[PDB]
């Protein structure tokens, strides 16, 4: 039985980046080069593996993380990057093993669409694969905020405001990050040429 990649890549709704979704892929056959030879992707960068060689490999598990960000932010979904997205929303480790895949979703995630949010305020950077869903008012000074917005007291999330009129750098992009797990355990996710 084939791994449910279509459930991730062709999902009708995608999550906001601060609340990125994770699907655990396990006990199935994965056809990576079907994805690889597709022409629908503006980004297909892999780290620690070769995209052509993926169908001959096995992993303990595969994780598929998915979310929507801005086109000029796709460069932050890579090891060693900084910025509002990598720092406070979704962080890849330095020794990342996997593939980052993205495509313009202007014709899907732009209506003025204010549904998609990102985290703007956070006192420390996320650890790799950390997910912070808190909505507590951000305390920018020494005075407690007590749950109300005001001076030095900011709501931590802000909306992308996707308008289909804008250039491609400011257009919404759906992203899928595939991470390949290799442990001293049974390998349940294998390519067809294994």
């Amino acid at each position: 039985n084939l791994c449910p990649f279509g459930e991730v890549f062709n999902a009708t709704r995608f999550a906001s980046v601060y609340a990125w979704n994770r699907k655990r892929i396990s006990n199935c056959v994965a056809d990576y080069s079907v994805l690889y030879n597709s022409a629908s992707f503006s980004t297909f960068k892999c780290y620690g593996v070769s995209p052509t060689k993926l169908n001959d490999l096995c992993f303990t598990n595969v994780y598929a993380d998915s979310f929507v960000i801005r086109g000029d932010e796709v460069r932050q979904i890579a090891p060693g990057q900084t910025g509002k997205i990598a720092d406070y929303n979704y962080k890849l480790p330095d020794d990342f093993t996997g593939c980052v895949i993205a495509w313009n979703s202007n014709n899907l995630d732009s209506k003025g669409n204010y549904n998609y949010l990102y985290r703007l305020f956070r006192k420390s950077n996320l650890k790799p694969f950390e997910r912070d869903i808190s909505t507590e008012i951000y305390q920018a000074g020494s005075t407690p905020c007590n749950g109300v917005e005001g001076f030095n007291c900011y709501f931590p999330l802000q909306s992308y405001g996707f308008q289909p009129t804008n250039g491609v750098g400011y257009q919404p992009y759906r992203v899928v990050v595939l991470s390949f797990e290799l442990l001293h355990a049974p390998a349940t996710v294998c390519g067809p040429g294994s």
Partner: antibody
Amino acid sequence: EVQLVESGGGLVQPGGSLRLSCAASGLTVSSNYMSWVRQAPGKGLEWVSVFYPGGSTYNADSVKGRFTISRDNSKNTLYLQMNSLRAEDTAVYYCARDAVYYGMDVWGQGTTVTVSS
Amino acid sequence: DIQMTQSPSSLSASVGDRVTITCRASQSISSYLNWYQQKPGKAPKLLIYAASSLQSGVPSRFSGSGSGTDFTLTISSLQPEDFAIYYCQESYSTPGLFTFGPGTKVDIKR
């Protein structure tokens, strides 16, 4: 109350170095997007450097490789180290807190840097 | 990057006038635009944030308007202390070294 107080401006030769400070009261530097913004004589405002709350820092291309923004949490103070200064770096330098959606609501009074031979 | 332009470069008005200043953005940046006033030799002062919200401490004669690509700042009854330069500012670009408009100077009509 709430204030930013810049110091360290002065006259320096081209190729020289200068360190500006910005002492904060009424907001936490390490918790904010803190900026240095300068204004040359008769010109408009130019962003110089920004310090993210979590630690990332960024420089405008105009000062790349020469200016370094930093901060000291114990003193609640923001700094700008300016090296390899040039005549066109002459300006009044402001420190400011950027609440990006809520605007740059707190500004210092500014400190003047003059670079000349 | 995003380039930002304001109209007009300069405006003449009298005390008690109703003044409107406009600002144009290289892209549609939704409601992410702020308005500032600057007097000669002083730091800019925040007047409007999020295109329409009045900064606390700023007199009610100041109001902001607009969305998307074009925004207008309005002074309902110009006071003597309002003669100054007015800047608009986008809060949208990456990584936070934002761009200011070129400024509209309001001087005294005679």
